[model samples]
Target: NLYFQGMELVFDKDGLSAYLEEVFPQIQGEFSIDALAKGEITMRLNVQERHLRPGGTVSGPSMFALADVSVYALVLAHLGREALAVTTNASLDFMRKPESGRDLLGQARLLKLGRTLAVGDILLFSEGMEAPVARSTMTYSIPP
Candidate 1:
């Protein structure tokens, strides 16, 4: 409760989805907002042939992209429609190979939301899989 102790959610699922579409049309349909709460959100990366290989497994770049957007979206969901918040730093760990033929779900939560910076973490998992395939921590710089 340290980061979002008294903070109320400024964006719900529909609001966040519309914001993302407005700012990042290139990413439309790439991720779906499955759930959203005050400080937490879940997005599903709709895996297609472009995101997979012969065996239908995902690559690192696609996984990282999911992590990146998850935190970015998480930051903006709490800060309103500030599209300028950018990732300042990030660390990602690939724990296991993702299960094929399933979408990757990026679940993110805020760690620290400051006046000028925000920190968050994302756990990416194969849809329907119990264990996460990757984990990422990201820091974002907020605009004034």
Candidate 2:
């Protein structure tokens, strides 16, 4: 079972989006928080030509960025404005090539949340698909 089930979100979509932009300026135009709820967060990657590979499929790095940010949002949703929380470890598996020209959606679930660490998994789906195109496990180090 997932941790923190039904825990209220400390941050909502707009708040998290603004927080991300303020803390991670490099990601200004790449991601958006679509939904925030207890123990879960949904994010979107604004797919563009730059996110595609030579064959025109969404690039692996782009999907990874989506997963990374999604889990980060999940952690912040639970922990409040802990923008200093950093990724300690991450493992990603690319399951299928994503559809080109569509935004990618990432749904992240928190598996564990503790004083020192937060662990979560993210599933990436191309817009309109039920099956995930990629999956990831992420661990974040919470600040003291």
Candidate 3:
């Protein structure tokens, strides 16, 4: 099971919106933060046509974006608005094909949070699923 250690940081909705506005240009529209716990954050993806591939499957890059943003959200929750908390490494496994009509959900948890580096894991799911469609591990380099 996924686990984290810290007081779960709540996303300041406006702050998150502002951050997303400045950082990510591709992801847009109405999405909500469902829960934050154990250094874990769950975000509901508002999927659009742009997120789909040629076959109507969610593109690999889209999945990567989800993993990246989710990990960043976890970092923000623990470390506050460190906009430069950038990803250093990422490893993702596509376990199953994602359905085109469903909203994707991402759950991210901090594996390790340190002064220099933060490591986290994320699981992606088709809305209302008991299993993940993809899993990822990422490391972010925190600046001094």
Candidate 4:
């Protein structure tokens, strides 16, 4: 079981997607919400040629975007439609190169939720990969 097992989700997949679209319209087609629960969210990036580097592998910035969005989704899932929630700190590590021509999935787990802040970690994996290609830690400032 995850950490926030008994907690209820504030937003479902569809609701979260819509909320994001309304607040962050520029990212509409880039990230898709896959699953949502009390303290966890799964998101996918529709990897395209634009997300690749010279070697035909997904770029670090692309993976970082996935991680950032995944954690944001989880925060909204727990805190309702708090569009003002902002990233205050972030750290990322690229463990391996992601496979080309495949989408990347991000799994975010909320580690701490407080009245003023939220913190979590995201693991990014290439589609069909058994291990993650990148990992990220982020802190978001929740509006009062």
Candidate 5:
């Protein structure tokens, strides 16, 4: 009976794309799930006029939202659909303001995945720029 059951958590690129459509419809067209693996994932925000501020640059909350979900999505990618971890603590560092009319990409990775906690970092980059726009850290509480 020891072999009867185990964790069946796995998500590929297309599978995650499909899953998000149902559970995360609010951000359906806003982000692109670029990559997924054991501990890392890449996501992109498709910047548009609606996401811009007075100067035509993307808003802080917009970029922060992307960073927030970047790590959230990474947890789901590795833990499974049932894993709905909550971010207990977060820190955002705005390294540079993003340029207008450019998409933002978030490179997120899990620093630790414990039985009851998860921690990670995300870096946001402007599509055409070399320097990162911002960096964020997330600490999540997972039910065991």
Candidate 6:
């Protein structure tokens, strides 16, 4: 079970957006943690031509980076600026071709939160998705 760092933890849309920008400036876009208690997070990456591959499909590596970074953000939000909490393992499955010409959205959830480790699952979707284009599981190790 995950222990609450504080009695009551609350993050609104504006706060979440600011936090993401402050912490992860490179990702630069609109992101909101819709449901923090449920460990659910959604992020929209404003994609450019640089994010695409030869066939114009978003590259797998790009999706992988998004999945990895999103999980890191969740861990930091709960634990607070713990950069030592490093990714220990990751597994991803590509489901289908992602649509081109649209920003990508990644939704993530913490599946397990322990004292020393955090496990998360993420689904990558194109602009407005009913189904995900890829799914991933990632584990992070928090230093003592």
What is the TM-score of each predicted model, taking all chains together? Answer: 0.91, 0.88, 0.81, 0.89, 0.87, 0.77
Kindly report which residue pairs in candidate 6 clash with one another.
none
Model 2 global lDDT (CA atoms, 0 to 1): 0.83
Query: Candidate 2 lDDT, tens digit per residue, 18-66?
Result: 9889888978888888888787888988887365564587778778888
lDDT tens per residue, model 3, 1-144: 555455456566556666666666655563556676656778777776456564576778878888888888778766776446878999999999887678788888888877788899889998876778999998999997
For residues 1-144, write the lDDT of model 1, one tens digit per residue. Answer: 335642577888898899899888878878778998777889888888355565778889888888888888877887786447878898999999999888899989888888788888989999999999999998988877
After superposing candidate 5 on the true structure, give the runs of residues whose Cα lies further than 4 Å from its correct spot. 1-9, 49-55
The residue-by-residue lDDT of candidate 4 on 1-144, one tens digit each, is: 566432677677898899888888878888888888777888988877365564587777778788998998788777776446899999998888888888889988998888788899988999899888999999999887
Q: Summing lDDT over every window of 10 consecutive residues in candidate 2, give the lowest-scoring window.
A: 1-10
Q: List the residue pairs that clash in candidate 4.
A: none
lDDT of 3: 0.76
Clashing pairs in 5: none
Pick by TM-score: which candidate is best? 1
Local error of candidate 1 at 117, Å? 1.1
How many Å off is the CA of 86 in candidate 6?
0.4
Q: Write the per-residue lDDT of candidate 5 for residues 1-144, one digit (tens) a residue.
A: 111122233888889888887788888889878887666778988887355565687778887788888888777777888888998998999889787778889998777777888788988998869899899998899996
Point out the worst 10-residue segment of candidate 3 by lDDT. 1-10
- For the record, the alpha-carbon RMSD of candidate 5 to the native fold, in angstroms, is 5.6
Candidate 5: Cα lDDT at 63: 79
- Model 4 TM-score is 0.89
Ranking by lDDT: 1, 2, 4, 5, 3, 6
